Ligand binder design. Structure first.
Ligand code: HEM
Ligand code: HEM
Ligand code: H44
Ligand code: H44
Ligand code: H4B
Ligand code: H4B
Ligand code: ZN
Lengths: 418, 414
């Protein structure tokens, strides 16, 4: 047993779920790696060509968990499923999930994502089975339908589309984009950057693949889709599917003249979904934004759009010294505008006060029914106004449960072209 | 072996070898991280104390380029005789200074460590009575305050012996405002300090029952009952909080004290335990402006400030709390700088800490840092530390938490 305490309310919770932890965190009793971005390379099966004694134990564990989840441990269907997975592995070196197992696994990977403040929503996830896909054109069709369903004219719905699992590591399906909808970034001749600097490398690959860049500040990037290990292919998302929000301020009339906008649907497309030893290398998932992601990180990181200096100018703030807090003052105003703008256009968004409150409630729920909730304080606490949100004062235990979402390498570092 | 940390904003990568030198638990396991737990998890025997002392003496003589020297070997033998004959030993003055500075250098939660080697150490190990502790502390406050040009200092009282004769400052800081529960459930003054205020009152303190009453010192010498002392008011430097643009802000009636001086921690050097070791530096603005003034459980002034700002408080998404928070923190910094009382804003402090960290990695092989504490409680990602990977581990000498003394003291009178 391990207790976590909220230092604002004095609520103490007791964690037993961590006893089911599978993978190393990176920490030891002598060193804590809680702020390392990727602390551990402890995986569940070697790189590929997993033998029977390597894959079957992972499959048995997942099937066991699913059938226990539904109160059917030891049932005929459970025992039948085990022998079924045994035969498939024997005859194909892999196995295939039932539709129910796939949905269960995708929801539990989200439920297990310790870095995610949005998991109160975890069991409301629309799962699109795209395991019949064979080509980049088919991937594009599946993605377009995902975007259209999830956007829902601004009433955003959480969804995930699951493309065929990895077989041998040479026939991977991959979305080369980091998100389905991102803005381009361009290296200027003098040395500055136009657009989004995070995406300069990916933009150059698109350009180097034939994409004609409009060379603007908010150029929706094309999709670069790889099916069955083949060379990736470019597709333009139909603009009527890409919902965008112009950013204005409820007090500063001049704010709109900064020419800022952002897109409504965040859709992460470069993670790997791991279920029962199976690896889904293309599994784009989407929900909706917390305001700070755009207002604090996308707009105000120094290596991102870096707009703090410009906003502070128009606000006529004393920018001579840091102690005037001109950065902090402009940062607030920017995040007010982002929220006001989304809310004005009826595009789903959550502020960091409401999101963190919801997450404290989700923590309650999880400790009550499940005996714990893995949570990464470093990621859960919002990047502004940390201590006036409830999660700042909440102790959290972090451990790794399966199914899960994992990082994976950018495919241009590993793909051999044709 | 080596460990690498990366700054994701600059892509600077640093190599940590110093973590190999740690031999104290963090609390994490290989399968669970407790990096956000506030504290994870009578005194030492002869056999426990021998290697602890050896490691520290070895570290000291290595630091002065005298490892293996005749003086090094004689000091080890001298220390060993004392442990054998007395079950304990006494630090040399140079060792004490070195140890106190390195406890600071090793404090993984402290963002102000670029200053670590400029620490005035007051040796108070000859003190025997609470009156003596008062004198030592008044002198500390006066030296450290320096009419607003704050200087870092520590005063070190006698080390623990059998655990039955501890020296303790019962206060959590040397200067701190009282808090009073009211019968209607409200709180006057600082809610954080209600319990200690009650203790003082019971010991005979007559409270003014105001919003900013400087608490008395409650001082325990040699394990005796603690005794009350009033710090002379002219030694307590205070700053009235006003705002450079909101003329109404002064009418909030806010003030704070200029000298932060923590007095409830334990200083461990070579296995010796200094249970009374108050230390002082200067404030980072957010400590007062974000935590002291805006924590819901503290002075909790967000509502009143936001009211006077005419903000829409009907919905969170107006970010009225965030807007009021910045203005309060502007006022705190402007007020201290106008009165020429040393303070550091969080941007300047985090910037210096990154330079300190890099310097430490270059000259020492690492710098244990607790990201959860180093990142300021507001505007996190617009400071450089937010993007800095860090490694947390425990080196000694170190500052440690210890139980509040009223939970363990066995009383003597009547
Ligand atoms: C429903 C609304 C949701 C909200 C408001 C939300 C909120 C967030 C936020 C703010 C982050 C931090 C992102 C960053 O700093 O880059 C995050 C991380 C994450 N979210 Fe959620 N989320 C939502 C839905 C989902 C869904 C549907 C999934 C998957 C099915 C998911 C999985 C994850 C994962 C895996 C991470 C960790 C990312 C990483 O390690 O880089 N979230 N979430
Ligand atoms: C010189 C100026 C200094 C500054 C600006 C500074 C800044 C800070 C800040 C902001 C914190 C976090 C406090 C909190 O959030 O509660 C902290 C923690 C800490 N500081 Fe420093 N500090 C300074 C000097 C010192 C000195 C002189 C010492 C001891 C010799 C020290 C030892 C510590 C320790 C041990 C902690 C951790 C306390 C804990 O774990 O609860 N600091 N410092
Ligand atoms: N910071 C940079 N790159 C960078 C950009 C973005 C990210 C974010 C990674 N994660 C994206 C993510 C994951 C999970 C959730 C979200 N946000 C959401 N609300 C959702 C997405 C899908 C469902 S909810 C975003 C990290 C580094 C750089 C600046 C300059 C050069 S690189
Ligand atoms: N927040 C509460 N309690 C509370 C918890 C922690 C603290 C402060 C703990 N840390 C003090 C500290 C330690 C180290 C450095 C500093 N800050 C400084 N700048 C220095 C102090 C000495 C040298 S530098 C402050 C105060 C009240 C409560 C609300 C309601 C009931 S209790
Ligand atoms: C070094 C540090 O771990 C890194 O900058 C983290 C900090 N916390 C974060 N928290 C969230 N939600 N997203 C992030 O990208 C980061 N970055
Ligand atoms: C639960 C969490 O560890 C706790 O609230 C911490 C967070 N980080 C902190 N950081 C600092 N500097 N001071 C604090 O008191 C805290 N509190
Ligand atoms: Zn850890």
């Amino acid at each position: 047993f391990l207790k976590v305490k909220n230092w604002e309310t004095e609520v103490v919770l007791t964690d037993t779920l961590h006893l089911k932890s599978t993978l190393e965190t990176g920490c030891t009793e002598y060193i804590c790696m809680g702020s390392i971005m990727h602390p551990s390379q402890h995986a569940r099966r070697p790189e590929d060509v997993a033998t029977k004694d390597q894959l079957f134990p992972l499959a048995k564990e997942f099937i066991d968990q699913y059938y226990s989840s539904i109160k059917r441990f030891g049932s005929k269907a459970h025992m039948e499923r085990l022998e079924e997975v045994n035969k498939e592995i024997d005859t194909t070196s892999t196995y295939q999930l039932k539709d129910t197992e796939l949905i269960y696994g995708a929801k539990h990977a989200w439920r297990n994502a310790s870095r995610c403040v949005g998991r109160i929503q975890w069991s409301k996830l629309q799962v699109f089975d795209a395991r019949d896909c064979t080509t980049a054109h088919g991937m594009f069709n599946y993605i377009c339908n995902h975007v259209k369903y999830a956007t829902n004219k601004g009433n955003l719905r959480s969804a995930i589309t699951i493309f065929p699992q990895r077989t041998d590591g040479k026939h991977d399906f991959r979305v080369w984009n980091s998100q389905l909808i991102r803005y381009a970034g361009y290296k200027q001749p003098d040395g500055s950057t136009l657009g989004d600097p995070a995406n300069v490398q990916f933009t150059e690959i698109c350009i180097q693949q034939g994409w004609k860049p409009p060379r603007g500040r908010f150029d929706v990037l094309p999709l670069l889709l790889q099916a069955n290990g083949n060379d990736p292919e470019l597709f333009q998302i139909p603009p009527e599917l890409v919902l965008e929000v112009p950013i204005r301020h409820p007090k500063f009339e001049w704010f709109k003249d900064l020419g800022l906008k952002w897109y409504g649907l965040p859709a992460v497309s470069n993670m790997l979904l791991e279920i029962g030893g199976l690896e889904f290398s293309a599994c784009p998932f989407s929900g909706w934004y917390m305001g700070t992601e755009i207002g604090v990180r996308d707009y105000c990181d120094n290596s991102r759009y870096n707009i703090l200096e410009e906003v502070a100018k128009k606000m006529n703030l004393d920018m001579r010294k840091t102690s005037s807090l001109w950065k902090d003052q402009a940062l607030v105003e920017i995040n007010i505008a982002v929220l006001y703008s989304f809310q004005s256009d009826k595009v789903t968004i959550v502020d960091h006060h409401s999101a963190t409150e919801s997450f404290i409630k989700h923590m309650e729920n999880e400790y009550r029914c499940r005996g714990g909730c893995p949570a990464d304080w470093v990621w859960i606490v919002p990047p502004m106004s940390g201590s006036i949100t409830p999660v700042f004062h909440q102790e959290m235990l972090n451990y790794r449960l399966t199914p899960s979402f994992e990082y994976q390498p950018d495919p241009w570092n590993t793909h051999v072209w044709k």
